[PDB]
């Protein structure tokens, strides 16, 4: 039982909240799709994006640079399915809105709808770090959209406590 390794709370038959590292959660599930909380240029310099890139030994960034050079930058709310690099079956790069730039927070709906294409998704709370969206607000957008099995992973115990009462 992969989740026995982690404190967690089942919210619905779709959505479970997990305390830990989303990369280590996804490693337990060979058929999971791991969500990267990315920016429009897929520049994975810090945050969960930097951690995912480091776990891939830089391979994620090389793949992202090829994609962006070929396709041009993404829009806020866009998502792109790329290779998993042995971290997960695939990695879904999702561009959440940046509240610092007063971008439309409701674009999180579009971000989370994109996860419904996959039978099992491991995701952080998109935009919930430096992009300035409060975790409970990002969770609100997630639970409204999720139609598949989603493990929502938070690496702060204070965030986990606040989300589980
Ligand atoms: N490995 C991780 N696993 C789960 N959550 C993370 C991880 N790294 C960062 N976070 C949090 O997930 C949210 C989105 O990450 P970020 O896009 O980097 O702001 C923020 O609340 C981060 O603090």
Taking the mean position of all CA atoms in its chain, how far away is CA 49? 9
Residues lining ligand 1, CB < 6 A?
Answer: 21-23, 37, 47-48, 51, 124-125, 128-130, 153-155
- Separation of CA 38 and ligand 1 centre (Å): 11
Q: What CATH code is assigned to 1-165? A: 3.40.220.10
Rounded distance from Cα 79 to ligand 1 centre (Å): 17
- Exposure string of 30-56, with b = 16+ CB inside 10 Å and e = fewer, is eebbbbbbbbeebbbeebbbebbbebb
Which atom number of ligand 1 is nearest to the Cα of residue 51?
A: 1
Which of 8, 40, 47 to mutate for ligand 1's pocket (most ligand atoms within 8 Å of CB)? 47
- Method for structure elucidation: X-ray
Per DSSP, helices labelled H in 76-115 are 108-113
Q: What is the dihedral of CA 101, 106, 109, 114, to 10 degrees?
A: -30
> Of 155, 145, 143, 165, whose CA–CA distance to 16 is shortest?
143
């Amino acid at each position: 039982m992969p989740l026995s390794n982690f404190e967690h709370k089942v919210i619905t038959e779709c959505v479970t909240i997990v305390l830990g590292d989303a990369i280590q959660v996804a490693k337990c599930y060979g058929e999971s799709v791991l969500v990267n909380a990315a920016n429009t240029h897929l520049k994975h310099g810090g945050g969960i994006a930097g951690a995912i890139n480091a776990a891939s030994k830089g391979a994620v960034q090389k793949e992202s640079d090829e994609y962006i050079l070929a396709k041009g930058p993404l829009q806020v709310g866009d998502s792109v399915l790329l290779q998993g690099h042995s971290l997960a079956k695939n990695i879904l790069h999702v561009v959440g809105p940046d509240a610092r730039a007063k971008q439309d927070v409701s674009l999180l709906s579009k971000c989370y709808k994109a996860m419904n294409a996959y039978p099992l998704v491991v995701t952080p709370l998109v935009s919930a770090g430096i992009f300035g969206v409060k975790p409970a607000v990002s969770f609100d957008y997630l639970i409204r959209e999720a139609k598949t099995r989603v493990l929502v992973v938070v690496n702060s115990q204070d965030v986990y406590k606040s989300l589980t009462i």
